[PDB]
């Protein structure tokens, strides 16, 4: 898809999207940019621009609002909540409240069209039910996370707040570009800070 300008190249690189952690596995090896002299893996920044574009498309497509962004992360649940406010659909739970998809007796029952997971390793349940219902699945995947069952990717960092902020932000921008309200080439009406998290009292 399209060449990495700035906003695109300064945004990901300024936000700690690049910095991935320990472990590589054979399937992920393709998005993996480089080795540091420590086991800390760096992701390709081009591939993130690329795999964010088609993800405006793929989610501008399912235009009815039953896209579900769930998170098991404490960090991530704030960016997600804010992301969902903009778009128009979200399932909130710390878990999935299993029987979101598979059961309609549950008082909280949705019937999605797409999902976004944050960590394939924590949100495995949301995946577990994503194989049965017949739902296509777009996400954020780390140097540690596989792509088994994970059919479309967005290889980005998800372990930190700045990043966890930037992405559910730029994405909230991109799908609003495609569907035709506020563009991904105009500066977003919403500030990044709300998606950014902070600990004053717990």
């Amino acid at each position: 898809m399209a060449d990495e300008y700035l906003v695109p190249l300064d945004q990901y690189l300024a936000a700690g999207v690049h910095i991935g952690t320990q472990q590589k596995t054979k399937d992920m090896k393709k998005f993996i940019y480089r080795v540091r002299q420590d086991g800390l893996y760096v992701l390709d920044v081009r591939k993130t621009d690329e795999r964010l574009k088609v993800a405006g498309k793929f989610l501008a497509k399912f235009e009815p609002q039953s896209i579900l962004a769930v998170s098991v992360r404490l960090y991530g649940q704030k960016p997600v909540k804010k992301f969902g406010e903009v778009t128009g659909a979200r399932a909130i739970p710390g878990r999935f409240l299993p029987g979101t998809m598979t059961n309609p007796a549950v008082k909280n029952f949705f019937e999605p069209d797409v999902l976004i997971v944050t960590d394939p390793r924590a949100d495995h349940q949301a995946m577990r039910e994503a194989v049965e219902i017949g739902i296509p699945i777009v996400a954020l995947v780390d140097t540690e996370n596989l792509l088994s069952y994970v059919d479309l990717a967005i290889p980005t960092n998800n372990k930190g707040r700045k990043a966890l902020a930037l992405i559910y932000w730029i994405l909230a921008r991109e799908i609003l570009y495609n569907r035709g309200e506020i563009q991904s080439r105009e500066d977003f009406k919403i500030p990044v800070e709300e998606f950014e998290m902070k600990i004053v009292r717990r």
């Binding site: 309609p104 029952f109 019937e111 049965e132 219902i133 017949g134």
Partner: protein, 217 residues
Amino acid sequence: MSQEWKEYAKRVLDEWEPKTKLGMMVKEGQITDIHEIFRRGYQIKEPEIIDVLLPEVNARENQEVLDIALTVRMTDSGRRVRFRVLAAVGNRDGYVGLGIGHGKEVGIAIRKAINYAKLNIIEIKRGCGSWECRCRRPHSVPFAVEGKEGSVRVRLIPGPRGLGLVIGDVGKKILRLAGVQDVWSQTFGETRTTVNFAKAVFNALYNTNRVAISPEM
């Protein structure tokens, strides 16, 4: 029986309230083609979706119960018996769903099972071609297939017209509910276990479509 057909489907369509998107589009009369539910792999979550396709009249949804079992769990100062049952939904016309169900009472289980079975419906592709010439109808399966369930190994084999369903009775019930007229049956490994043997035949008739052949091309 004629028009009374849709009338059961429309009587179900009086108070049937869709849980799913699948149950909705069907209840709207859209994609009125069971086959057009299968190809796509859209989840059969509602029982009634099917009751929508199979009226009183033409295909005749032959509901049938194979085995009813009584099992126990031992509990404090108690034996808690229940029942398991195996039921077969199918049209002679080339669909089938095998169901089993477990329950305390008998009647319920029958009911459970009848429902269970609906979800797990399957097309059996029959042998248009036949064995020898595609003279008229699909008498058989296209290709010999085998089932695998615990110890049980069932081969279905193409066949001559009129040489009809040459298998053990248990399967013979299921097959008839499929719509295979003619088929050589080569079993191997304990069938005593009905549930499986059945699961075998079902799996088998299931795998029909899973075979990838040349005439598809």
